[PDB]
Short mmCIF file of all heavy atoms in Angstrom, two decimals:
data_model
loop_
_atom_site.label_atom_id
_atom_site.label_comp_id
_atom_site.label_asym_id
_atom_site.label_seq_id
_atom_site.Cartn_x
_atom_site.Cartn_y
_atom_site.Cartn_z
N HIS A 2 41.31 166.45 283.33
CA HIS A 2 42.56 166.46 282.51
C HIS A 2 42.72 165.42 281.39
O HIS A 2 43.29 165.75 280.35
CB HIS A 2 43.81 166.41 283.41
CG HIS A 2 43.72 167.30 284.62
ND1 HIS A 2 44.18 168.60 284.62
CD2 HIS A 2 43.19 167.08 285.85
CE1 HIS A 2 43.94 169.14 285.81
NE2 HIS A 2 43.35 168.24 286.57
N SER A 7 47.87 166.64 276.49
CA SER A 7 48.86 166.53 277.58
C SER A 7 49.50 167.89 277.94
O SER A 7 49.90 168.09 279.09
CB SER A 7 49.99 165.54 277.22
OG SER A 7 49.56 164.47 276.39
N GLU A 12 59.80 171.70 282.81
CA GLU A 12 60.64 171.40 283.94
C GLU A 12 59.86 171.64 285.21
O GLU A 12 59.31 172.71 285.42
CB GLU A 12 61.90 172.28 283.90
CG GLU A 12 62.77 171.99 282.70
CD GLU A 12 63.95 172.94 282.57
OE1 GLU A 12 64.46 173.42 283.60
OE2 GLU A 12 64.36 173.18 281.42
N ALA A 27 56.41 156.01 300.62
CA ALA A 27 56.42 154.62 300.12
C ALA A 27 55.01 154.12 299.76
O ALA A 27 54.84 153.29 298.83
CB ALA A 27 57.08 153.72 301.14
N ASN A 106 45.22 152.06 285.72
CA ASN A 106 44.75 150.68 285.66
C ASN A 106 45.84 149.64 285.44
O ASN A 106 45.58 148.60 284.86
CB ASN A 106 43.67 150.58 284.62
CG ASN A 106 42.36 151.14 285.11
OD1 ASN A 106 41.85 150.66 286.14
ND2 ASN A 106 41.78 152.05 284.37
N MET A 125 40.66 141.80 274.11
CA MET A 125 41.54 142.74 274.75
C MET A 125 43.01 142.47 274.43
O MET A 125 43.78 143.40 274.26
CB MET A 125 41.32 142.78 276.25
CG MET A 125 42.17 143.86 276.97
SD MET A 125 42.20 145.55 276.33
CE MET A 125 41.08 146.34 277.50
N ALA A 130 47.80 144.41 271.47
CA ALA A 130 48.82 144.24 270.41
C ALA A 130 48.69 145.37 269.39
O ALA A 130 49.70 145.96 268.98
CB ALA A 130 48.63 142.89 269.75
N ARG A 145 62.21 158.44 267.52
CA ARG A 145 62.55 157.59 268.65
C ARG A 145 62.25 156.17 268.27
O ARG A 145 61.26 155.58 268.73
CB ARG A 145 61.77 157.98 269.89
CG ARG A 145 61.96 159.41 270.32
CD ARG A 145 63.39 159.72 270.70
NE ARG A 145 63.89 158.97 271.87
CZ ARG A 145 64.87 159.39 272.67
NH1 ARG A 145 65.50 160.57 272.46
NH2 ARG A 145 65.22 158.66 273.71
N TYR A 154 55.46 144.71 281.46
CA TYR A 154 55.47 145.77 282.43
C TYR A 154 55.47 147.17 281.81
O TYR A 154 55.22 148.16 282.51
CB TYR A 154 56.71 145.60 283.35
CG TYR A 154 56.43 144.55 284.42
CD1 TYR A 154 56.66 143.23 284.18
CD2 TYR A 154 55.89 144.90 285.65
CE1 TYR A 154 56.38 142.26 285.15
CE2 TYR A 154 55.62 143.95 286.62
CZ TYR A 154 55.85 142.63 286.35
OH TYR A 154 55.60 141.69 287.35
N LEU A 166 51.50 152.47 275.68
CA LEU A 166 52.92 152.22 275.93
C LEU A 166 53.55 153.27 276.85
O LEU A 166 53.42 154.49 276.60
CB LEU A 166 53.65 152.19 274.57
CG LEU A 166 55.14 151.83 274.60
CD1 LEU A 166 55.38 150.46 275.17
CD2 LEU A 166 55.70 151.95 273.20
N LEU A 185 67.90 137.11 280.04
CA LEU A 185 68.55 137.04 278.73
C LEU A 185 67.90 136.09 277.74
O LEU A 185 68.05 136.28 276.56
CB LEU A 185 70.05 136.66 278.84
CG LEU A 185 71.02 137.73 279.38
CD1 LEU A 185 72.46 137.20 279.36
CD2 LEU A 185 70.96 139.03 278.61
N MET A 238 49.10 127.74 273.32
CA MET A 238 47.95 128.59 273.62
C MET A 238 47.44 128.50 275.06
O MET A 238 47.29 127.41 275.62
CB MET A 238 46.76 128.23 272.71
CG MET A 238 47.02 128.41 271.23
SD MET A 238 47.58 130.08 270.81
CE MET A 238 46.12 130.97 271.30
N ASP A 249 41.96 129.91 262.97
CA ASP A 249 42.49 130.83 261.95
C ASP A 249 43.06 132.17 262.49
O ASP A 249 44.15 132.57 262.09
CB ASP A 249 41.43 131.10 260.87
CG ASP A 249 41.27 129.92 259.87
OD1 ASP A 249 41.83 128.82 260.07
OD2 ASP A 249 40.59 130.11 258.86
N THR A 252 46.06 131.31 264.65
CA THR A 252 47.08 131.03 263.65
C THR A 252 47.71 132.26 263.08
O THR A 252 48.92 132.31 262.94
CB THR A 252 46.43 130.28 262.47
OG1 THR A 252 46.08 128.99 262.93
CG2 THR A 252 47.36 130.16 261.25
N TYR A 264 65.39 135.15 263.53
CA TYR A 264 66.80 135.30 263.91
C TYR A 264 67.46 136.51 263.26
O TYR A 264 68.07 137.34 263.95
CB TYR A 264 67.54 133.99 263.59
CG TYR A 264 68.96 134.05 263.99
CD1 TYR A 264 69.36 133.68 265.28
CD2 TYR A 264 69.92 134.56 263.12
CE1 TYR A 264 70.68 133.78 265.67
CE2 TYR A 264 71.24 134.67 263.50
CZ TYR A 264 71.61 134.28 264.76
OH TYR A 264 72.93 134.39 265.13
N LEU A 275 53.38 145.84 261.48
CA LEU A 275 52.67 145.30 262.65
C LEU A 275 51.24 145.88 262.73
O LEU A 275 50.32 145.13 263.04
CB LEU A 275 53.40 145.62 263.96
CG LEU A 275 54.82 145.05 264.15
CD1 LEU A 275 55.41 145.48 265.48
CD2 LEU A 275 54.87 143.56 264.05
N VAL A 276 51.08 147.19 262.54
CA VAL A 276 49.76 147.88 262.61
C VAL A 276 48.83 147.26 261.58
O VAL A 276 47.73 146.82 261.91
CB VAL A 276 49.88 149.41 262.45
CG1 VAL A 276 48.51 150.11 262.34
CG2 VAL A 276 50.64 150.02 263.62
#
Side-chain angles (χ1 to χ4, degrees):
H2 317 268
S7 328
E12 295 175 31
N106 283 303
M125 184 49 102
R145 302 298 296 206
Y154 280 87
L166 184 61
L185 287 182
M238 299 305 296
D249 283 9
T252 291
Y264 182 88
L275 299 178
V276 173

